[PDB]
Ligand binder design. Structure first.
Ligand SMILES: [Zn+2]
Ligand SMILES: [Zn+2]
Length: 61
């Protein structure tokens, strides 16, 4: 699209990260551990996925 593909970033969609990043296993987006509505305070050492890699108003889980 305009600004690249939009859905492709090595940083946080919301909190504009740059260093430490936790990304999905599906899409090319990176987050903290609480940038989305289904936020965690713990670091998911196993698996982790986005709510919908977008506005977390929908049901991700
Ligand atoms: Zn994703
Ligand atoms: Zn973040």
């Amino acid at each position: 699209g305009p600004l690249g593909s939009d859905h492709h970033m090595e940083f946080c969609r919301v909190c504009k990260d740059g260093g430490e990043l936790l990304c999905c296993d599906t899409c090319p987006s990176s987050y903290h551990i609480h940038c989305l509505r289904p936020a965690l305070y713990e670091v998911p050492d196993g698996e982790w996925q986005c709510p919908r890699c977008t506005c977390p108003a929908l049901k991700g889980k």
